[PDB]
Design a protein around this ligand. Sequence first.
Ligand SMILES: O=C(O)c1ccccc1-c1c2ccc(=O)cc-2oc2cc(O)ccc12
Lengths: 219, 216
Amino acid sequence: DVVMTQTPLSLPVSLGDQASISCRSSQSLVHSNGNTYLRWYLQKPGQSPKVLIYKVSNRFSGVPDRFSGSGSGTDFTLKISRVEAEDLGVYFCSQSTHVPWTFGGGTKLEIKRADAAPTVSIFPPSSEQLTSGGASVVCFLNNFYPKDINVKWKIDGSERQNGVLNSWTDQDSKDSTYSMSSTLTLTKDEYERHNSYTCEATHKTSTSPIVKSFNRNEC
Amino acid sequence: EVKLDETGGGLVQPGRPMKLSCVASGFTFSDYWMNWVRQSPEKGLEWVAQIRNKPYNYETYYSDSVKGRFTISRDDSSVYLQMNNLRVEDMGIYYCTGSYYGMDYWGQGTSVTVSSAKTTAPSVYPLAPVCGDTTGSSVTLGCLVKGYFPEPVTLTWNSGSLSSGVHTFPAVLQSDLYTLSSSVTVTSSTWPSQSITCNVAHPASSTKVDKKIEPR
Ligand SMILES: O=C(O)c1ccccc1-c1c2ccc(=O)cc-2oc2cc(O)ccc12
């Protein structure tokens, strides 16, 4: 099991910028036969990985000349000379010298933009849902940048783990921001035993958590 | 002009098996090594199994994790993968690859869903701004689509007239059933002055719901 470590995991760039991505193997990629079987792949959303580079530095037919691979032994580099829109995706390196064949974790190529704090909205359970014996508390954290963010659920000031469902959007085409959905699901019984429900988000944009709260009794 | 087109995916109750078929269509099938690779719900690309050729005495290799349960085979044209004893952890997208002198060609992929769940219609709920209080210039509304199965729901805002300011979050599997949510940001001029309706479809259970967002 050769370990392919890929760096960085996310690479913000502006269109026309040059980008470089690295890959390290645990063991040497040099096959007894003399070949170095290291491949570079690009996966655009909704499609399958397509190889760009094979055997370190051979560019597959039809791949733009703006892509080039280099390295030897256990250190490999992928280089894009002028980032275009159609270049955005996830890039993987993979070795095929040793069984089992293995892959790196991916590097996402995304647009660079100014930091923007999340706009947080909190939503108590709807009447229709309580009527069913369930109570879902929802929090939207919209249009923020960078993507990194932590969300904490607090009930009567104590932290709640269990029953949280998080979902994230992909970088927005228009503005380059990300959005996130955090839903805490409780039983109607539980929701009626507690009063204070809070959504607290930690983001680089601010030193202190972004808090959004509601009191059930005040509903 | 290398072509790989896999087939044979769907739902599978765990413990149960399934058979994946890939017909390699634009090369000397005999000269290439064939492979099965899968991609898990996240960032996890995984090499599953390998079937070599004559020269390499049709050796067969398999990843730790499917060893004794899956069989790669070839029809010198096509390659098959017999998936037996399907667990949840084997849920992912499955791609067929043709390998040759360092190069690799991938097909389209086939999704393999492993779940006990049966077809269940979603519960759609209106998400109105806070317990009759503070919100409204520009107000944010939402719609919650809870516990449906399988895979596909469609959510629209005002029958698709209102497209801007909406965010639709990818569905996530909450212990055998999916949940989806969507937000729409309007202006205080607009709501509740106007009508804001969440439209949801779940073709598989024949559901078509329209939920109006009313001031809570
Ligand atoms: O690289 C070859 O000599 C080769 C030729 C035709 C078919 C397969 C291979 C091939 C390998 C052949 C022998 C071997 O010891 C290792 C090979 O690794 C390969 C890795 C690939 O990605 C892709 C292909 C190979």
